[PDB]
Design a binder for this molecule. Structure first.
Ligand code: HC4
Length: 125
């Protein structure tokens, strides 16, 4: 178990040191995306929420392929503006509903310390 709290103010510093098998110890879902929304990392806790096998989603586009209910101004729209701006730190609730039981979650999106990477953190509410 890796001790990190959802929403912590220096979470990107914390996760920088972590390997993929370390990300799997987090109490919340964590996805790492490039600027184009392609999944670079995907932890086990997100797999528990969405039903995806984490290995099978790496390389796919989060907005186009994997999570199409996120393709909207309220989610994808924010990300695309954070990528354009190169700054992003936003937290909001959303309902995941694509090919799964509708589940209400808290999403936190934040820029990584990495130069062109972005985090999406997901926990149940
Ligand atoms: C809407 O599509 C949000 C999330 C999501 C993530 C994974 C899967 O498989 C479905 C939906």
């Amino acid at each position: 178990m890796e001790h990190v709290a959802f929403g912590s103010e220096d979470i990107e510093n914390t996760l920088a040191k972590m390997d993929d098998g370390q990300l799997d110890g987090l109490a919340f879902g964590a996805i790492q995306l490039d600027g184009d929304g392609n999944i670079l990392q995907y932890n086990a806790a997100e797999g528990d929420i969405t039903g995806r096998d984490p290995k099978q989603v790496i390389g796919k586009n989060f907005f186009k392929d994997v999570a199409p209910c996120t393709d909207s101004p309220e989610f994808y729209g924010k990300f695309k503006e954070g990528v354009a701006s190169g700054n992003l730190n936003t937290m909001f609730e959303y309902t995941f509903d694509y090919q799964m039981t509708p589940t209400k979650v808290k999403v936190h999106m934040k820029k990584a310390l990495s130069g062109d990477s972005y985090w999406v953190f997901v926990k149940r509410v």
